[PDB]
Amino acid sequence: FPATV
Amino acid sequence: FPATV
Amino acid sequence: GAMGSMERASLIQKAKLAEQAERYEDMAAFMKGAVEKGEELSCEERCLLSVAYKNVVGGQRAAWRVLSSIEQKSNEEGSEEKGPEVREYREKVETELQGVCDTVLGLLDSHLIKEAGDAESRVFYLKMKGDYYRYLAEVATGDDKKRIIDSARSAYQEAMDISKKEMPPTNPIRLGLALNFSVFHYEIANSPEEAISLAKTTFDEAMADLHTLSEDSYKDSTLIMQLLRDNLTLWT
Amino acid sequence: GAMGSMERASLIQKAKLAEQAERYEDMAAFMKGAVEKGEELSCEERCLLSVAYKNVVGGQRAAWRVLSSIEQKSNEEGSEEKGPEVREYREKVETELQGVCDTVLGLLDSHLIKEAGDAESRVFYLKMKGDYYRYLAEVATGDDKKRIIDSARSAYQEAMDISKKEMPPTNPIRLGLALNFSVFHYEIANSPEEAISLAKTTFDEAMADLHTLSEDSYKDSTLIMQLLRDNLTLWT
Ligand SMILES: *SCCNC(=O)C(C)(C)Oc1ccc(Cl)cc1
Ligand SMILES: *SCCNC(=O)C(C)(C)Oc1ccc(Cl)cc1
Ligand SMILES: CCOc1cccc2sc(C(=N)N)cc12
Ligand SMILES: CCOc1cccc2sc(C(=N)N)cc12
Ligand SMILES: [Mg+2]
Ligand SMILES: [Mg+2]
Ligand SMILES: [Mg+2]
Ligand SMILES: [Mg+2]
Ligand SMILES: [Mg+2]
Ligand SMILES: [Mg+2]
């Protein structure tokens, strides 16, 4: 999964 | 902490 | 609300203790109670709210993906009928996730966003609104799926418009918003080219602004820039 | 009970799914419902029950230790008064932990132990009874603390007496019981010499029995033997 903040 | 199962 | 009798400051103090104890469901309940006191939140308090619910819903999302994977395998050719249980339990986790998303969206609508006038607060809350509609979109399959997706897009877009006018390109909230809207494009909107263009333009414009920053601000901004480049590496 | 309308087999199936999804609170609720169907549990089902509640209470114990540490620091000399919040929140976590322990002890008493006639089931349940009284003892400070400790000791002792008569020295349940009773001696009963003697004698008697085992049984027994030697290394 891609990075999110 | 010591091991328990 | 069960937290109605507790002092605002005590709720904030216990949210911080819950974070130290990795009790994120507690941390979220404490922050929900703090929001419901009706006063605006400080920068630190906005972080406590977002950390709490990000961890709760993150766990639910991970669980939902495990169960959805099992459910998909069960529906392939040659698989032995196992009954309704996998679907039921995926639906149970999904309903709990939707409930958390509705709760957060409820706090934003009643009444955090309408009182948020500074860019640092308003962009942060609108980004959160985009995030929790995005989580709803990840599990949506019904008549309202496109409207859920467009709700996420609309919130992210309003946040972007403000962030571009009112924040420097290295502002960590601007960067994090762009990171997440880029992931929205890639994973939700089936727009990988827009995801890549946004991540790249955001990265490059931040790079050009780093020279204005102190050492500590530099550290904050480059941290989020590295996440943009990690995603770009995944996608190209 | 909220699980009263669900089939026993569906509860077991969903407990296994919850474990795959690391949803241990769900897994425990499903196993509680399965126990409350009133039928005896199989070996695998006993493992599902113990894994679920071990993970739930393990998380609560970790949280309680974090908070107790903060509380102790707050009560040292020179520390600034912070109000009742740390104590309140430690008490909240502590009450929830005690509730989980009471629930498990309730299942054992009503009516798992009284129907457990084979050593493999009876020793397993009595070990669990010792374990959950031990967790209660870890947080106990009142008039009944010594009685809680003695309840743990009594359950462990009955389990030991059966295990020595009815199980080989390499049986993993016998080994795990001895591991945990040894930790009870060290950490709860202030009897480090008894803890060390039990761990060492258990290890040595298992060693001498390994030659009777298949490769797979050998792997199971040596795994628990290594935990005995890890504790011995910590303690000597
Ligand atoms: S607000 C939580 C504290 N901040 C963080 O954990 C990191 C990820 C380092 O920074 C950001 C979080 C959220 C945003 Cl919108 C931007 C930076
Ligand atoms: S019953 C859960 C499955 N078993 C285990 O996870 C390990 C720790 C490998 O074995 C034992 C667990 C519990 C006992 Cl009493 C003995 C072995
Ligand atoms: C924004 C105001 O204070 C922060 C700045 C930067 C990182 C963090 S982490 C955090 C927390 N309790 N997780 C708060 C903050
Ligand atoms: C005892 C019957 O079956 C097991 C033997 C050995 C290890 C495990 S682990 C496990 C579980 N769901 N975690 C079940 C078992
Ligand atoms: Mg007040
Ligand atoms: Mg649904
Ligand atoms: Mg553009
Ligand atoms: Mg039935
Ligand atoms: Mg108490
Ligand atoms: Mg002896």
Ligand 1 and C178: CB distance under 6 A: no
CB D191 within 8 A of CB D183: no
Backbone phi and psi for residue D77, each to the nearest 5 degrees, phi listed first: -75, 135
Question: Residue type for D173, please?
Answer: I
- Environment of ion ligand 9 (residues, CB < 5 A): D 94
Residue D2's nearest CA partner among D25, D22, D23 is D25
Please tell me the residue having the least CA distance from ligand 3 atom 12: C48
Q: Which atom of ligand 1 is nearest to the CA of C223?
A: 9
Could you give the CA distance from residue D90 to residue D67 in angstroms, rounded to a whole number? 6
For chain C, the structural domain boundaries read 8-235
Q: Which CATH architecture has domain D8-235?
A: Up-down Bundle (1.20)
- DSSP class of residue D41 equals P
Could you give the CA distance from residue D159 to residue D173 in angstroms, rounded to a whole number? 10
- The resolution, in Å, is 1.7
Question: Locate tokens 């957060």: which residue?
Answer: C104
Cα Rg, chain B, nearest whole Å: 5
Residue D226's nearest CA partner among C101, B5, C3, C2 is B5
D223: its two tokens? 């795994």
| Cis amide leading into C211 (omega within 30) | no
Question: Locate tokens 């249980």: which residue?
Answer: C85
CB atoms within 10 A of CB C151: 19
D50: its two tokens? 């113990």
D187: its two tokens? 């950490």
Could you give the CA distance from residue C50 to residue C28 in angstroms, rounded to a whole number? 9
Ligand 3 and C217: CB distance under 6 A: no
The crossing angle, in degrees rounded to 10, of helices D172-187 and D145-166 is 150
Q: Could C22 and D89 be called an inter-chain contact, meaning their C-beta atoms sit closer than 8 Å?
A: no
D1: its two tokens? 């009970």
- Closest partner residue to D63 among C23, C86, C92, by Cβ? C23
Could you give the CA distance from residue D88 to residue D60 in angstroms, rounded to a whole number? 15
Could you give the CA distance from residue C66 to residue C110 in angstroms, rounded to a whole number? 33
| Cis amide leading into C111 (omega within 30) | yes
What long-range pairs does D69-78 form, CB within 8 A, spacing at least 24?
Answer: D70/C17, D70/C20
Question: Locate tokens 């084979």: which residue?
Answer: D118
CB-count burial class (<10 Å; 0-12, 13-18, 19+) for C153: buried
Helix (H) or strand (E) holding D42: none
SS (HEC) of D120-146: HHHHHHHHHHHHHHHHHHHHCCCCCHH
Question: Which residue does chain D place closest to C8, by CA atoms?
Answer: D85
